[PDB]
Specification:
2 copies of one chain form a homodimer. Chain A has 664 residues and is α/β, with parallel strands linked by helices. The first copy, chain A, is built from 26 helices and 22 strands. The interface between A and B is large, with 43 and 43 residues. The structure holds 2'-deoxyguanosine-5'-triphosphate (2 copies) and magnesium ion (2 copies).
């Protein structure tokens, strides 16, 4: 509350003032236990700072360090700001400026403009960027989609090294394994039989612990993807279970499903489902939709697998999701039908947070780089006070900058494995998202489930896409289209909402944009992929993501600001009020004396029907180039209740059906 | 007892008679679950059999299948003989003949001579050979000494793949890790710190389970080597412990010590010992003896490590050996001082059974191929009955054949990893050994601890070395010396006993041999390395190794044959006799009515002082080109009792001080 004006002002006492001087300390730094030079800025950047020392130190408006809250800033403090001898050397306005340089190089113009927006909290970059930008070998990329190289030991161990090598800097991982022969399959080279998928998981799990993000930082985090027609499926969904045969689990990895529609059909038609080893049914994961059912269906009839009740596996699945909140569900066909990267071949997985959908292959590791726009920062008191409005014009302007920013990162990024440099330089996927969605709605006195909010959600995401395409367009005008652009849905003028079959909302001239794209190309294969934003929404102080509030009272106990103020204005904020939020989860519902309109504005995500949540997710998805991390929350979860969340969303044509499942 | 004349004769009913016909069944074989051709003979051999069908089927004397005992043969049955549909297709005389071809090619002369000796039980080959010889991709090699490629993730994971790739056919492994930076050391690339050696062990342990020798056969088996000056040493010795912090053990690997003399000195002088990370003290394992102490000593004084009491670590060690029977102790200097491969660089480890000492490096994986001569088979009733003798003339003749055999294997072997083909083709190490040593002594009415037995042990091993060198010499006459011969102790005329500083015993003309070696070279870098022989001594029916009997009564309960007969001749074999062997471990000592000379002949290895055992080990070692697997057995093990076994043997200049430690 007050210890934010106080712990911020304390580090202002115990830290150097001039920027160029902080760079100097970092650049010159030497590990004392080893007498070894351990610089924390790169040559390229160090130089830049020096040759503009005056222009740069006089940019940094230091009164801007007071835009961060209590835990906003103590998060920047504990893990983000660069550290001399356990002592913090970087002020928050120093991390920003360094990030801006780390991104912009000799374009000190772009640098300064990027510095201003980050300091006035218009937007921010994902954690890898904030940590590493402007430093010796800058690894600014959050996520990696990796292919299992081949159904062999060589392939397996080659993929296992790669995962270590990636895990050792720090990037999540999405690995897919559709091709590993299942328990029992023959091996020609040793007249032997396979123990299947689980022991293989176990090795990876293991490397995931050993390679603790560059030694002593964070233990690795892997998402693994399968298609539910793989014969090891029952054991694969159970990987995070709490009970028995320890030798058969793998508690530090996340199972995700790559779900073909056929599967969903079978389940609702209460029919059969057939399980295969990839060696008996080759090719199932190198095609989708119709061509897939044609081929799946034939393999089937040919006696090639083991059939059970489609519904047996489904029950298995819901059982696991209820207990672990996993596996995730990403819809394979939905993904491939509506991806701008379809000319590349069949996309085989998503990432760790289920927002990225990008082509991956043995020699191509899909990479993506994220930033998030701060939705609340564009709200303004109207043109006659006593009333508020949203500035879509600025938002558009802003998304353009972040779009350009995310490009430079592609060029100035340091790549852990050659597969990822090959991948990223060819297709250039970028990933924008949002935060403060629930805050924006709140500020505007629009409940999350209203028709105004529903409308707002649509138009916010419209301008963000339209902008991120406009600017990807200008860049292709300057630097050429991405190399793999010829052939894409985009090159024909098919944009994201076109392939969902909808007219756009229309707040922006889509006809003109498409004309230019068709004409000159765009720089990026992809652009929009709203992410969890867990770490960075904390720092800016917004509710993460697009999810609504889980609670109006967090934990040290902090009550939702926007509500807090409302209560005291309505002269009802005493102690009885504080105490009916403490044990009762922070739900202002059914509460002795609180106006029905506040009750409508301050709903906990458990009080929003998951039918409404899905709808809005389905609405913004028309402008989402990739997918998005859709978490689901039920209180009293019956088997059927889950069953209609999955089916509803699938029938909505969602790419990501479910990320997590938070329960109870 | 009788069910060996009965279970052997039963498979004679349920198996094809003609050899060429069995080859045919194998060669043509098709896995029914996959409709895939799975031949069990190679093209090369299949052809050979066909084009000599008549000469070959009429070689096989089938009355020779009755030379195997009860569990001798049911061991050949359960795991050795090739199997059609879980049905056995190969007779024992078929496995032999196939092995002989698998080895000898178009030299059908050598083939037939090799077939005869194997069937009359003159000698045999190690398990990889018996299994694989003459089959599609013949992997005939028991052991692999592997180098940790480099102190990096790339290096670590590159070594981990290699180990999988090796483990997947089936060869033990000796890996050494002297160079991996220890807990806490700095990492430049991620401004981080190392969790050290244990988690690294844990990954390897893991790959060792996953890669179950070609899928569904045997779980992998790794020996790991360290020098006790490595800072993770206390945790490394404890790897097989039975108690706490599960996250800190690794129960499926074997710790072994590469022990520098300095360490032993410090311990007996009750002085200091200093622990280093290889990154603080680089080079300790790329030198030995004096140059090492010079360098170790300096690093020390320079403040580079952490000193404790030499004796602290020693106590740690004996504590672990008492409880687990591990780590093994191989003496580094002893090994390098007296190796014919010293011109190659510094040998850094032994194998899994502690008998191999061969040069290894990141790109060179040391390989060795074993066989074992059947010591009893050369005993003969003298030249006037009523008395026995040993035919050293035949033994010599025989060791020559096995020597030639072991060569062809080098050329016809299929190599799992390129490192091992490079290694083996350059240096050509071969490994002969023995079995039936305790049987030989018994047959001859010479107690294991006598002066006659002591003499016999010396001369047996003399002729075996002299022969294996003579024939390696003739081969260098035919095919050229091994490529790395120029420079060796051998090229100068320095033979194995010379570098122990002893005159040979003299039963064979050593002057003439050395003349030829100096003149023409020898084919092999090394030749003699007596092994555990566990699996194959079972089959031929001899007591394994050179170790004496552990028991006169095994388990179905079988009593030592040579004793059994003695008792019934001495008219004292009733039931009371049987019953004073059952619970009382099979020790005929201090027993109501059994002649003191039998008591002297039928000693259990626990009743032989380990001082005697060491002496004989020290005696034969002068003719052992490599080292040998020296197991130790104590009943009432005090700390000091162990301490003088280690020190005694070290001062004896033994290379392998201790393999296992069987206790209680
Ligand atoms: N659990 C276990 N799995 C194995 C082992 N060896 C191979 N595999 C599994 C993993 C791979 O997905 C599959 C194929 O391995 P490879 O391609 O190295 O087998 P190879 O080329 O000898 O035989 P193939 O012709 O592919 O059947 O076999 C083993 O020793 N243990
Ligand atoms: N536990 C753990 N150990 C690591 C990690 N990254 C590296 N290591 C250890 C294993 C290696 O023996 C040692 C060196 O690894 P590298 O050569 O790949 O480190 P790099 O080249 O970045 O730094 P260097 O210049 O060698 O300190 O660091 C990690 O994320 N976790
Ligand atoms: Mg294969
Ligand atoms: Mg390195």
């Amino acid at each position: 509350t007050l210890a934010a004006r106080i712990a911020i002002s304390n580090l202002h006492k115990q830290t150097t003032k001039q920027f160029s001087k902080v760079v100097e300390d970092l650049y010159r730094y030497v590990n004392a236990a080893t007498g070894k030079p351990a610089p924390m800025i790169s040559d390229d950047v160090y130089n830049i700072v020096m040759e503009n020392k005056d222009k740069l130190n006089s940019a940094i408006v230091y009164d801007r360090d007071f835009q961060y809250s209590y835990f906003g800033f103590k998060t920047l403090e504990r893990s983000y700001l660069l550290r001399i001898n356990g002592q913090v050397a970087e002020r928050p306005q120093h991390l920003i400026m360094r990030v801006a340089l780390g991104i912009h190089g000799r374009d000190i113009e772009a640098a300064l403009e990027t510095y201003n927006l980050m300091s006035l909290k218009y937007f921010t970059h994902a954690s890898p960027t904030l940590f590493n930008a402007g430093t010796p070998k800058p690894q600014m990329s959050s996520c990696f989609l990796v292919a299992m190289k081949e159904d062999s030991i060589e392939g397996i161990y080659d993929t296992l090294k790669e995962c270590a090598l990636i895990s050792k800097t720090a990037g999540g991982i999405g690995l897919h394994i559709h091709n590993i022969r299942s328990t029992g399959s023959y091996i020609a080279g040793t007249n032997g039989t396979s123990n299947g998928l689980i022991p293989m998981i176990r090795v990876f799990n293991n490397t995931a612990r050993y390679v603790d993000q560059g030694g002593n930082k964070a233990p690795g985090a892997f998402a693994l993807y399968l298609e539910p027609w793989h014969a090891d499926i029952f054991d694969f969904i159970d990987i995070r279970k709490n009970h028995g045969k320890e030798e058969i689990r793998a508690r530090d990895l996340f199972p995700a499903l790559w779900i073909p529609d056929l599967f969903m059909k079978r389940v609702e038609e209460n029919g059969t489902w057939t399980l295969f080893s990839p060696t008996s049914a080759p090719g199932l994961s190198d095609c989708y939709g119709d061509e897939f059912e044609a081929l799946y269906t034939r393999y089937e009839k040919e006696g090639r697998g083991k059939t059970i009740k489609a519904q047996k596996l489904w029950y298995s699945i819901l059982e696991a999701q209820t207990e672990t909140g996993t596996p995730f569900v990403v819809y394979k066909d939905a993904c491939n039908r509506k991806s701008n990267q379809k000319n590349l071949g069949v996309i085989k997985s998503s990432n760790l947070c289920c927002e990225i959908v990008e082509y991956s292959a043995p020699d191509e590791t899909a990479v993506c780089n994220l930033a998030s726009v701060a939705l609340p920062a564009f709200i303004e008191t109207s043109e006659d006070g006593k009333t508020s409005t949203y500035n879509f014009k600025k938002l558009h302007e802003i998304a353009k900058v972040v779009t350009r920013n995310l490009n430079r990162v592609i060029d100035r990024n340091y790549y852990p494995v050659e597969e990822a440099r090959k991948s990223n330089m060819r297709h250039r996927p970028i990933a924008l998202g949002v935060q403060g969605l629930a805050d924006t709605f709140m500020l505007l006195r629009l409940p999350f489930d209203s028709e105004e909010a529903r409308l707002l959600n649509i138009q916010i995401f419209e301008t963000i896409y339209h902008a991120s395409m406009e600017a990807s367009c200008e860049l292709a005008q300057k630097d050429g289209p991405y190399e793999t652009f010829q052939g894409s849905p985009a090159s024909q003028g098919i944009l994201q909402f076109d392939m969902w079959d909808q007219k756009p909302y229309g707040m922006w001239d889509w006809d003109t944009l498409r004309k230019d794209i068709m004409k000159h190309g765009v720089r990026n294969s992809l652009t929009m992929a709203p992410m969890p934003t867990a770490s960075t929404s904390q720092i800016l102080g917004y509710n993460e993501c697009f999810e609504p509030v889980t609670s109006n009272m967090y934990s040290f106990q902090v009550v939702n600001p926007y509500l807090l103020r409302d209560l005291v204005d309505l002269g009802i904020w005493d102690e009885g009020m504080k105490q009916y939020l403490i044990t009762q989860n922070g739900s202002i519902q059914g509460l002795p004396n609180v106006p029905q309109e506040l009750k409508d504005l301050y709903k906990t995500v458990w009080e929003i029907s998951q039918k409404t949540i899905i709808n809005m997710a389905a609405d913004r998805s028309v402008y989402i180039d990739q997918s998005h991390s859709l978490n689901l929350f039920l209180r009293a979860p019956t088997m059927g209740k889950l069953t209609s969340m999955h089916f509803y969303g699938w029938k909505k044509g969602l790419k990501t059906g479910m990320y997590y499942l938070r329960t109870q």
